[PDB]
Amino acid sequence: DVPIEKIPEHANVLLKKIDACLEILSKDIGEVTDAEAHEMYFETSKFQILHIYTGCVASFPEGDVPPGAVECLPGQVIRTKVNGEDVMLEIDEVDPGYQVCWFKPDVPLPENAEILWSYPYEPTAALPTGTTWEEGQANVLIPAEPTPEAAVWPPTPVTNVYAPMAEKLALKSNPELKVLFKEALLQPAKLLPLDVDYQCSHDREVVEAKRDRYLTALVEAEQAPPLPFTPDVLQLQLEHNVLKGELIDRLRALEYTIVTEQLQARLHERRLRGDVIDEWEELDYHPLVRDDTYLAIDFGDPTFGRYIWKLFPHTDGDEECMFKDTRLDVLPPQVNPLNAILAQHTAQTPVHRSLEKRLWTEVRATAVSE
Amino acid sequence: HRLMLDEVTESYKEIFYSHYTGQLRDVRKCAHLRLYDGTSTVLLLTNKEPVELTSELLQKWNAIKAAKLSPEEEKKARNEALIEAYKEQELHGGPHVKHMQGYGIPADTPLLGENAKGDQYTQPPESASIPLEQLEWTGDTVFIPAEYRTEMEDWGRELTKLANQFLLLPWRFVSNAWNQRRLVSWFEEILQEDALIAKEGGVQALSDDELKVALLDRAVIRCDEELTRGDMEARYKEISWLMSLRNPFIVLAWQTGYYRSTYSPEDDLPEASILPKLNRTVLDVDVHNELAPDHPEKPLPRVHPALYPNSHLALAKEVAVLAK
Amino acid sequence: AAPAEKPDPALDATKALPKALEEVEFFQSYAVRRKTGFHLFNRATGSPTIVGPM
Amino acid sequence: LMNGLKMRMFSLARQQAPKIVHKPVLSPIPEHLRLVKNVAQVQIDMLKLLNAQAAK
Amino acid sequence: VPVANFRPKKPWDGPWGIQISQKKDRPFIAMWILFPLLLVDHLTREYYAYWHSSKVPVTDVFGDF
Amino acid sequence: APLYPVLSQASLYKRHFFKNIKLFHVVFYVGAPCVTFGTAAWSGSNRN
Ligand SMILES: CCCCCCCCCCCCCCCC(=O)OC[C@H](COP(=O)(O)O)OC(=O)CCCCCCCCCCCCCCC
Ligand SMILES: COCCOCCOCCOc1ccc(C(C)(C)CC(C)(C)C)cc1
Ligand SMILES: COCCOCCOCCOc1ccc(C(C)(C)CC(C)(C)C)cc1
Ligand SMILES: COCCOCCOCCOc1ccc(C(C)(C)CC(C)(C)C)cc1
């Protein structure tokens, strides 16, 4: 009660569904940038935080420190305002033979000092302006973040032998070609250059056998079939019904997995809105893993890893197997066991039975004919 | 890494994680779990030595039993096959039991001290005097499953109780031996019921409710499924063949796969499906063909029985039963 | 009886002392101090004390 | 990077909403469905050719 | 027709995950109530016997005395 | 259409305060008053 033409409609539906899933799941949450979440990273620095909004910062060679200058060693955190942006600067890898210090305006600068960046004079101002790092004053590097190639699943190839045959059918299935056959067999003298043939030809038997060959070639052309062989319709309907059932069961399994993908996507929608999801509330949206995980808890064995290294031996020795995706490195082979089965069948059978089977097929063809 | 085997891995995955994929399972992949065990043997006890039973000897004995000969000829042919198999195994290197940890055949007893008569350090048994041509079967048999990992003894206090719960048997406040006997009695009942169904004309002679109740007794169906008749018949055939092998562990592994149901947290999801219900037939079950264990991380697709050569000939019984 | 087990790298000991030295280096990194306001009474010889600079 | 200095700059702003990054999710379901599509089209063309032969 | 291996929840399916979280974090909540109670129980305590004590605090558990 | 008793964002915000404690966050924060006003330093000296 389910014809084979109705399948691609179902495939279109499931493609729409999984695309609506993957367009959501392709998004992911980046690193958090809230300063309130990372203020303790600066609280726990090896030096107290310098709230610098006045004076200048200068680099000068190592040696005696000017009295009044605040050293800025590696690990020093500095709260400033840069081009209207409140920022924290963490000192890292000051060059050798040189040191950096904050010089308030009360402090005179030494000789051979280089002002890296300076602040303006704004004593009446309540909200200071900070600095303005011009192009060439500071080389700021944005991380490149080269987006690698999107992981594409390999499409398996499918040899369509019958599409050339469909094209040949579209070619032969014309009314004009049959009209030409109808007017060629009735009057083939029109086509051929018979007056020239009889003129040059010394024996009329050649011209007669020539026309008798063209007639037979035309009768064979019209009476030939689209195919070059005699298909056994029973074995083809057999393979068709088997492949149909395998396709319906495959579509049912894919819908079964799509349900879990549109569940993980319905949950990921909330995560994208900024809502915090509990670990177990999130596990409930993975019901099949939730069940097996709950049973592992019931048993009480929190260990893991050799089970993975046995089920997927390509991960053996890989401690960071969980943080990778080697499904493309390890794909199921496209080998047909039917070839090994027919090979063992031919190896067991003799040759006279193979020729007998050719006779059974020929007699079956004549039986279907009669 | 110390306990599992790397060749049964893909079959293990297909048997225990098919609720993830939604694909059907092949019973032969559950039968592959017997690779954890050793070779199950059957020693026939004779008046001289024990002999390991083989498919050839069993075929000969079935042929002699089918010929319906006089007992004077029957016993003679049986003993001829017996001495032939004895010579065969003596050329093989003795029975399989000699070189298996936990089992063994003793050699001739030793002679201690002054009882040792020079070079003859041994004392053969009385039956060594009997000539080999008088080899006769005593009528006694010894079955040795050689279940080193599957045996019901090593299961434990919990697994047996849970198997009896799953089969709706009594389980509380009893030893694992008594629950084992209860399980074996249930198993015997199911086999006798299979025999009576085969006498009464198979599964197709049964009604729908009767088949539903049979599958509930076999513990392969839950009442929240509403399968078809062909699916029910195929399921029965599957578990019938699997229980013919007489192994509760693989039986339970097969049965438990049909009882992994989930609950969704949302009301809209899961959506109403578009495809029809899953339907099968008795023909879809491949029992008459062997299946090698798939190599780890190299699984092979499933071949229908119809694609095999001479399938219309092999399935002719099932074809006649279904078309009729 | 003759199990033939391969060596497991997780059972080796080649990370405990490096990790302890990493923890101690993290500890001593917070001992870095500037030159301004620095004073430490040395011993009578002029050599530094033990507890002083820590 | 400055002359005689290197530094790490951190912004100071409350993040009101999460930052999204397009990490495409690998899945075999679309290729499964496309394989099903191709096989079904093969069988449909096969049936059409067989009907054309048997009737013409 | 619905999808297979799916069903509605039942009482024997146990509590939900959010309920399991609410069960888990109750000890963590009672921690805040009990550690101050521990410190108060230690600080507001008095010894029970001295060199001058003619009596010792007795606590009849079952009222037999 | 979640069928479970969805827990509010503020309730999760409050429970996170209770379950995001660390071991040192308990040990040192409760041991300092304990060690100072305990059987070692103050209460012990008094009561002994
Ligand atoms: C000349 C007198 C001595 C010198 C001058 C006075 C002392 C001045 C020094 C400062 C005051 C010392 C107080 C001594 C009190 C004492 O005797 O200590 C002992 C007494 C109890 O001793 P007794 O019961 O035996 O009399 O304890 C108290 O007084 C209770 C004080 C409560 C303190 C709580 C502090 C909480 C801090 C926040 C921590 C948060 C973490 C979570 C924990 C819940
Ligand atoms: C002489 O002493 C040698 C004894 O060696 C002890 C080896 O164990 C070292 C454990 O030390 C730690 C402590 C914390 C950690 C980390 C950084 C992983 C803690 C964490 C989880 C908070 C980040 C790692 C190692
Ligand atoms: C958890 O275990 C880690 C604890 O490790 C503590 C190690 O204690 C020794 C630290 O004390 C010192 C010792 C020397 C020094 C400095 C004085 C190294 C010498 C210096 C700064 C002059 C080069 C600093 C701290
Ligand atoms: C030489 O070492 C002396 C320091 O020992 C101090 C003893 O402190 C008691 C426990 O302190 C902690 C607290 C937390 C931890 C961590 C942060 C690693 C806890 C963890 C694993 C839950 C993150 C480790 C030790």
PDB file of N, CA and C in Angstrom, chain E residues 16 18-19 21-22 25 28-29 31-32 35 38-39 41-47 50, chain F residues 3-5 7 12 15 17-19 21 26 30 33-34 37-39 43-44 47-48:
ATOM      1  N   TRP E  16      11.849  13.358  37.751  1.00  0.00           N
ATOM      2  CA  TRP E  16      12.545  14.029  36.672  1.00  0.00           C
ATOM      3  C   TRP E  16      13.959  14.426  37.098  1.00  0.00           C
ATOM      4  N   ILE E  18      15.283  17.587  37.003  1.00  0.00           N
ATOM      5  CA  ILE E  18      15.234  18.784  37.829  1.00  0.00           C
ATOM      6  C   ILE E  18      14.887  18.429  39.269  1.00  0.00           C
ATOM      7  N   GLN E  19      14.035  17.422  39.462  1.00  0.00           N
ATOM      8  CA  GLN E  19      13.712  16.978  40.812  1.00  0.00           C
ATOM      9  C   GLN E  19      14.897  16.272  41.452  1.00  0.00           C
ATOM     10  N   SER E  21      18.000  17.047  40.818  1.00  0.00           N
ATOM     11  CA  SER E  21      18.865  18.161  41.202  1.00  0.00           C
ATOM     12  C   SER E  21      18.403  18.807  42.502  1.00  0.00           C
ATOM     13  N   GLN E  22      17.093  19.016  42.637  1.00  0.00           N
ATOM     14  CA  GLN E  22      16.553  19.563  43.875  1.00  0.00           C
ATOM     15  C   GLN E  22      16.780  18.628  45.055  1.00  0.00           C
ATOM     16  N   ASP E  25      20.824  19.076  45.907  1.00  0.00           N
ATOM     17  CA  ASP E  25      21.334  20.299  46.510  1.00  0.00           C
ATOM     18  C   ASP E  25      20.738  20.600  47.882  1.00  0.00           C
ATOM     19  N   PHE E  28      23.682  20.547  50.462  1.00  0.00           N
ATOM     20  CA  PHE E  28      24.454  21.770  50.297  1.00  0.00           C
ATOM     21  C   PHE E  28      23.752  22.958  50.937  1.00  0.00           C
ATOM     22  N   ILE E  29      22.421  22.939  50.979  1.00  0.00           N
ATOM     23  CA  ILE E  29      21.681  24.009  51.635  1.00  0.00           C
ATOM     24  C   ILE E  29      21.750  23.864  53.149  1.00  0.00           C
ATOM     25  N   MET E  31      24.049  22.597  54.789  1.00  0.00           N
ATOM     26  CA  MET E  31      25.405  22.937  55.205  1.00  0.00           C
ATOM     27  C   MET E  31      25.458  24.331  55.815  1.00  0.00           C
ATOM     28  N   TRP E  32      24.844  25.302  55.136  1.00  0.00           N
ATOM     29  CA  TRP E  32      24.852  26.680  55.609  1.00  0.00           C
ATOM     30  C   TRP E  32      24.125  26.831  56.930  1.00  0.00           C
ATOM     31  N   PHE E  35      26.758  24.293  59.779  1.00  0.00           N
ATOM     32  CA  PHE E  35      28.080  24.753  60.204  1.00  0.00           C
ATOM     33  C   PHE E  35      28.016  25.916  61.187  1.00  0.00           C
ATOM     34  N   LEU E  38      27.066  24.287  64.268  1.00  0.00           N
ATOM     35  CA  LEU E  38      28.216  23.624  64.873  1.00  0.00           C
ATOM     36  C   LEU E  38      29.058  24.604  65.677  1.00  0.00           C
ATOM     37  N   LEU E  39      29.367  25.754  65.081  1.00  0.00           N
ATOM     38  CA  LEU E  39      30.163  26.750  65.787  1.00  0.00           C
ATOM     39  C   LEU E  39      29.439  27.281  67.018  1.00  0.00           C
ATOM     40  N   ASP E  41      27.170  25.599  68.754  1.00  0.00           N
ATOM     41  CA  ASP E  41      27.136  24.504  69.712  1.00  0.00           C
ATOM     42  C   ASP E  41      28.455  24.377  70.444  1.00  0.00           C
ATOM     43  N   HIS E  42      29.561  24.676  69.769  1.00  0.00           N
ATOM     44  CA  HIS E  42      30.845  24.629  70.451  1.00  0.00           C
ATOM     45  C   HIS E  42      31.060  25.855  71.327  1.00  0.00           C
ATOM     46  N   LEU E  43      30.629  27.029  70.867  1.00  0.00           N
ATOM     47  CA  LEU E  43      30.955  28.262  71.572  1.00  0.00           C
ATOM     48  C   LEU E  43      30.068  28.466  72.792  1.00  0.00           C
ATOM     49  N   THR E  44      28.787  28.100  72.705  1.00  0.00           N
ATOM     50  CA  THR E  44      27.856  28.247  73.815  1.00  0.00           C
ATOM     51  C   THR E  44      27.841  27.026  74.724  1.00  0.00           C
ATOM     52  N   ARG E  45      28.924  26.253  74.754  1.00  0.00           N
ATOM     53  CA  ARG E  45      29.005  25.047  75.562  1.00  0.00           C
ATOM     54  C   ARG E  45      29.718  25.335  76.875  1.00  0.00           C
ATOM     55  N   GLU E  46      29.341  24.580  77.903  1.00  0.00           N
ATOM     56  CA  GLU E  46      29.973  24.636  79.210  1.00  0.00           C
ATOM     57  C   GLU E  46      30.396  23.233  79.614  1.00  0.00           C
ATOM     58  N   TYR E  47      31.560  23.137  80.250  1.00  0.00           N
ATOM     59  CA  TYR E  47      32.020  21.871  80.794  1.00  0.00           C
ATOM     60  C   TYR E  47      31.033  21.354  81.836  1.00  0.00           C
ATOM     61  N   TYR E  50      33.840  19.734  87.469  1.00  0.00           N
ATOM     62  CA  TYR E  50      34.974  20.484  87.979  1.00  0.00           C
ATOM     63  C   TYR E  50      35.471  19.803  89.246  1.00  0.00           C
TER      64      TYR E  50
ATOM     65  N   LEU F   3       6.616  18.991  29.675  1.00  0.00           N
ATOM     66  CA  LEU F   3       5.721  18.286  30.577  1.00  0.00           C
ATOM     67  C   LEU F   3       6.232  18.218  32.008  1.00  0.00           C
ATOM     68  N   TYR F   4       7.423  18.759  32.289  1.00  0.00           N
ATOM     69  CA  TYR F   4       8.018  18.687  33.613  1.00  0.00           C
ATOM     70  C   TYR F   4       7.879  20.016  34.346  1.00  0.00           C
ATOM     71  N   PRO F   5       8.026  20.023  35.681  1.00  0.00           N
ATOM     72  CA  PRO F   5       7.911  21.284  36.428  1.00  0.00           C
ATOM     73  C   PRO F   5       9.106  22.194  36.224  1.00  0.00           C
ATOM     74  N   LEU F   7      11.797  24.860  36.306  1.00  0.00           N
ATOM     75  CA  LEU F   7      12.300  25.618  37.437  1.00  0.00           C
ATOM     76  C   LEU F   7      12.754  26.976  36.923  1.00  0.00           C
ATOM     77  N   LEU F  12      17.190  28.839  39.823  1.00  0.00           N
ATOM     78  CA  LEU F  12      18.484  28.272  39.456  1.00  0.00           C
ATOM     79  C   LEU F  12      19.629  29.193  39.857  1.00  0.00           C
ATOM     80  N   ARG F  15      20.110  28.534  43.563  1.00  0.00           N
ATOM     81  CA  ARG F  15      20.678  27.223  43.862  1.00  0.00           C
ATOM     82  C   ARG F  15      22.135  27.128  43.431  1.00  0.00           C
ATOM     83  N   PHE F  17      24.340  29.378  43.832  1.00  0.00           N
ATOM     84  CA  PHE F  17      25.129  29.883  44.948  1.00  0.00           C
ATOM     85  C   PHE F  17      25.433  28.793  45.957  1.00  0.00           C
ATOM     86  N   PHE F  18      24.512  27.855  46.140  1.00  0.00           N
ATOM     87  CA  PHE F  18      24.690  26.812  47.136  1.00  0.00           C
ATOM     88  C   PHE F  18      25.495  25.637  46.615  1.00  0.00           C
ATOM     89  N   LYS F  19      25.361  25.299  45.331  1.00  0.00           N
ATOM     90  CA  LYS F  19      26.057  24.134  44.794  1.00  0.00           C
ATOM     91  C   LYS F  19      27.377  24.474  44.110  1.00  0.00           C
ATOM     92  N   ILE F  21      29.947  25.819  45.572  1.00  0.00           N
ATOM     93  CA  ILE F  21      30.966  25.955  46.603  1.00  0.00           C
ATOM     94  C   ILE F  21      32.108  25.004  46.290  1.00  0.00           C
ATOM     95  N   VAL F  26      34.887  26.089  51.772  1.00  0.00           N
ATOM     96  CA  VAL F  26      34.342  25.651  53.059  1.00  0.00           C
ATOM     97  C   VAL F  26      35.418  25.589  54.129  1.00  0.00           C
ATOM     98  N   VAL F  30      35.360  28.422  57.131  1.00  0.00           N
ATOM     99  CA  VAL F  30      34.808  27.950  58.396  1.00  0.00           C
ATOM    100  C   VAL F  30      35.881  27.559  59.405  1.00  0.00           C
ATOM    101  N   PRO F  33      37.336  31.041  61.827  1.00  0.00           N
ATOM    102  CA  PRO F  33      36.630  31.264  63.098  1.00  0.00           C
ATOM    103  C   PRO F  33      36.717  30.090  64.046  1.00  0.00           C
ATOM    104  N   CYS F  34      36.718  28.868  63.521  1.00  0.00           N
ATOM    105  CA  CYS F  34      36.794  27.686  64.370  1.00  0.00           C
ATOM    106  C   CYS F  34      38.128  27.610  65.095  1.00  0.00           C
ATOM    107  N   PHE F  37      38.300  30.744  67.677  1.00  0.00           N
ATOM    108  CA  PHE F  37      37.400  30.693  68.821  1.00  0.00           C
ATOM    109  C   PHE F  37      37.099  29.249  69.202  1.00  0.00           C
ATOM    110  N   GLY F  38      38.098  28.378  69.077  1.00  0.00           N
ATOM    111  CA  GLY F  38      37.915  26.963  69.327  1.00  0.00           C
ATOM    112  C   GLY F  38      38.691  26.414  70.501  1.00  0.00           C
ATOM    113  N   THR F  39      38.769  25.084  70.567  1.00  0.00           N
ATOM    114  CA  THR F  39      39.464  24.384  71.639  1.00  0.00           C
ATOM    115  C   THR F  39      40.972  24.606  71.602  1.00  0.00           C
ATOM    116  N   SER F  43      38.527  29.337  73.317  1.00  0.00           N
ATOM    117  CA  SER F  43      37.645  28.525  74.143  1.00  0.00           C
ATOM    118  C   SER F  43      38.428  27.490  74.930  1.00  0.00           C
ATOM    119  N   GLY F  44      39.449  26.899  74.313  1.00  0.00           N
ATOM    120  CA  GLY F  44      40.261  25.932  75.027  1.00  0.00           C
ATOM    121  C   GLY F  44      41.005  26.550  76.191  1.00  0.00           C
ATOM    122  N   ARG F  47      38.300  27.437  78.940  1.00  0.00           N
ATOM    123  CA  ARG F  47      37.660  26.310  79.597  1.00  0.00           C
ATOM    124  C   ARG F  47      38.653  25.404  80.308  1.00  0.00           C
ATOM    125  N   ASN F  48      39.929  25.428  79.922  1.00  0.00           N
ATOM    126  CA  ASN F  48      40.942  24.649  80.612  1.00  0.00           C
ATOM    127  C   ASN F  48      41.638  25.442  81.703  1.00  0.00           C
TER     128      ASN F  48
END
